[PDB]
Symmetry: D2
Subunit: 340 residues, 4 copies
């Protein structure tokens, strides 16, 4: 039941063509620290992971980045803005898995090219001053570009998975674990516990050979509230999450996803969620360290990549709505930071 096995270039090949620049290296290292500070309550800025549900077009992604960069800089004292640069998508059943798996968007599975494109995009983003985030779904691909990533997500469908927790335990960036598809938070709390410890498992080296990897633990993990059978973004759900986190002795600072099961897949509700968060930040909101927003140049979605700057996976808010949502959150958090 295996059709074929094909030639794969090892990470060192891509690392040779596209070595990390000093300026990229500095941004990554820096943003990781900054985020770690948010995770552990040492800085009260709000982390904002924002951008497309998935990258299908580097040029659009670069243009998006350039716009977002101005706002990253403008709001830098209230918000820590990092771009969503997602290359791997977990499907409910089957479908396009992302740019790495099939970069020509036609069923050709040109993975060598996909991995090259993903590294290239990430390098250009970091070079221009925009840090990047992604969902780490595969066990092997991260060796190809993890060095360019400032923050990582483990998805709702894999938070419970031991191999994903293992993976997170060895990543050098902070990591967010989503609650489960039906709303189970415990699995994410458990995942932080697990990922913070040392693990031994089989992995693949930068030279494309299998090996035993021994990780040191990732101390910068946190939970992401992304809704379930019902939304879990409000104050009450946040307060209950926080108590459970303190109970298991892990960080009670969390991220709230404005999209997915919290917006019920209606991109026009992301603003409502952000409005609720804004209010929580104004009243108290002490347990919130970040938010997640799926955002693009052009709002909505499409099945085929016909329109530029428009998602082919989950529907996104457009650029206008994005400017508004960011100003809303910046304003709200400026007040939270002023209180102490």
């Amino acid at each position: 039941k295996i059709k074929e096995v094909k030639e794969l270039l090892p990470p060192i090949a891509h690392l040779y063509e596209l070595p990390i620049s000093k300026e990229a290296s500095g941004l990554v290292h820096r943003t990781r620290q900054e985020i770690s500070d948010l995770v552990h309550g040492r800085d009260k800025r709000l982390l904002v992971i924002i951008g497309p549900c998935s990258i299908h077009d580097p040029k659009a992604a670069l243009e998006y980045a350039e716009r977002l960069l101005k706002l990253r800089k403008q709001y830098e004292n209230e918000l820590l803005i990092v771009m969503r640069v997602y290359f791997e998508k977990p499907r409910t059943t089957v479908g396009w898995k992302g740019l790495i798996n099939d970069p020509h968007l036609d069923g050709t599975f040109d993975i060598n090219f996909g991995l090259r494109q993903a590294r290239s995009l990430l390098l250009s983003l970091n070079n221009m001053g925009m840090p990047a985030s992604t969902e780490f779904l595969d066990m092997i691909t991260p060796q190809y570009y993890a060095d360019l990533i400032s923050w990582g997500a483990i998805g709702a469908r894999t938070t419970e998975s031991q191999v994903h927790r293992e993976l997170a335990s060895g990543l050098s960036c902070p990591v967010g674990f989503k609650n489960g598809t039906d709303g189970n938070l415990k699995i994410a709390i458990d995942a932080i516990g697990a990922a913070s410890h040392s693990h031994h498992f089989l992995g693949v080296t930068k030279a494309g050979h299998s090996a035993i990897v021994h990780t040191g633990g990732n101390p910068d993990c946190h939970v992401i509230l992304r809704g379930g059978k019902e939304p879990n973004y409000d104050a009450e759900h946040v307060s209950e999450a926080a108590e459970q986190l303190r109970a298991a002795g892990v960080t009670d600072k969390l991220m709230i996803d404005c999209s997915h099961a919290n917006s019920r897949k209606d991109y026009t509700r992301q603003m409502e969620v952000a409005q609720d968060i804004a209010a929580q930040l104004e009243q108290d909101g002490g347990n919130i360290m970040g938010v997640m927003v799926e955002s693009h140049l052009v709002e909505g979605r499409q099945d085929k990549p016909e329109v530029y700057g428009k998602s082919i996976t989950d529907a996104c808010i457009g650029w206008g709505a994005t400017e508004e949502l960011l100003a809303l959150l910046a304003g709200a958090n400026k007040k939270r930071m002023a209180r102490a």
Copy 2:
């Protein structure tokens, strides 16, 4: 990352412990037999039974030699295959199984663990006992999948795309558990996904990464393992079956007598089997198999002090095992007659 250590590739182990003709024949055969059960071509009942986890190959061999007599005795009613689980998903942390740490002392001697697991599996198949395991890691299966007749994807990974990818390329039938809180849809979805062709990054038998292109696994099914509440009874089975037919996949399913269906009390496994027995007597058309956590000695222990006694989930003992198997054999003999 603290360290990176010297991993032998599968071909090393395959060279020392090549699959024998007799093992190869048993595997191939038991895979077909199970496929038949999955697709309703045979009415025997698949019974995946044995320890929660293997921590001692000698005990596992003795268990096997007892189970073998019953496999034979009940071969017309039951298809008995031994649980030979080498990888254990922990809720947080703990011992991850014999592969990850075979000396049990925190030494993580994986090369040795993989060797021991292959060796045990080869001896089991050689003696006429087929084997089953949970495929948890993406890379370890290359080392011994050829000796496995049936595979499980655990409750914790059924929703995971990489595990569905993996299942898509396994040559054995595969059971997907419903989720830890009882969600069945994820398992139905997983069958759908695993039955299709996938492209992903994997590791060859020579220990090098490569692009793998799978052909799909047509012999997947669902496993009812309880959630917030048990899901083994006739009603839950009927509801499961309707959902499965609705998604156009096999409406033949497996019921786990342990874990969340026994509420983590090994003494309830018998109750669940009693309910299944009754369903098999009345009708039970949608049941193709059961799962039972069983050992020489009942219960559990935190240290491997007593021989033949689980150090992970508590198991029923051998006495209780003979009883459960006779109970299911008797019940299914009637279902097969009535057809």
Copy 3:
């Protein structure tokens, strides 16, 4: 007694960045056949392997190529001109081993870069319509660029070596085996015999992993007369070589090296040797299928790479002398071909 082990990119990396073009592929394939034809007496054109003793500067090599190309074309009915593009040099004791082993020429041993440069140069040469030749000295480097090579040499110092005969047995290009440093011809005749057979040995794949290679034999091997304690380029030496070749049942068509031990340390002598060959081609010269000439933009040699287009290994004839030598051989062989 091993200091270190360093990261080596596998051939597939270089093959991905610099894949062989259709035009290059066609030229190589074609030139291999054309040379095979000479080796086995199906065409009477004269193979001329000509160019620098070693490549130390790709720009000079490209300019040399552009000049040589015009002559390749001009003389294409009489001569088959292929450029010497030698990247690996055997030293009598120690010294610079070539551009691959140390491309910056400062003792840095940047082999990943050297291999890249060598591939790049070879691709550009073939793309411009100039086929290439080299000495295959290492067992592993050929995987990186053999696909761009139209004719290969096994050196005087390795003709007797079984691993080099093995290597030749698997090369897809014709191969010339030099007589030994003291003039022993038998070792080259033996080598043809060996290289023409099937071998099993340990090699390295294009992915940089060791494997058992099973070769089919190279049926296009021939001998190269390169002098010894005494020169062996004249008619008598050629006739005696030819008799020995027929006796061992292998091709009695051979190449004569105008340089090295045949010119005895004065590069000017190369012209004398070519004069003698010319005369042989006028009288009869039936057993001669090619010649080898060490040639550059500028004549002579130098210890440091100070002057452009001037060898830093064996001394070469200059471009003027080169035009002369080629016209001389073209004129002579035109007559040999006319006799028929």
Copy 4:
């Protein structure tokens, strides 16, 4: 991959090293014998290195039995001779033929290299375990990773002494190395090879895990020349004295080894004794520049095309065990006197 028929699965050295890890006793013998030989190479000890045994190993059981006999003599003569067994797994052919036990261990054209490499490691481990150190010709670039840890002394053959990749290889081996003069008698190429091998090199090699890598060697300071004849023999005093002057001149060790076989015996195994007799006499008169000898020896004398008779070479002809006992006593006696004069 045009005139390549196939590519087959090769187990990496680490596989074999896992099944057959070097024992403490083996490790100690190897380390110790390497030092002892180094001492001979550099004139710190006057014992005579004797590399002796079959031209090629085609049968491990015969090799073990040979070893057990040779061991008694290794012990008996330990104050005069340093005896190390010839355990040659790779044979360079003049054209084609059987290339040795590694390349084709079933001796039938099956090229079961994985098995050959296993057998070679196993034999070497058993030899060192029983107290018999081992020597081989390093011919391939890749096979040595599989068993070099079990080798106390290495040869680079007449046909490869001039080869740069073999000099590179020697530069990274942990054992002493002998370079043979060329097939027609050229000694310079061996002197050059010592020079080269003693320096640091960078080249492409294969790791113990079966991946290519850049290897940086530190140089092998324990290389020496081996006189093995050419168009004419080169074992006598005069040839030795002329070799020695050339060695001093290039600033490398003037202590050398003389091969009693191959071109020195004109491929007549009955002449090996004559050569040893000449050496013996040189050791009695002076023989200051001689640090060792090489002898092609087996249980049974002669050779055969097919492996019919036990203990009988299928490559160069060897002297038999009787002749071996005599040759060793002859050299022991002779060298006991040389060591007395000091």
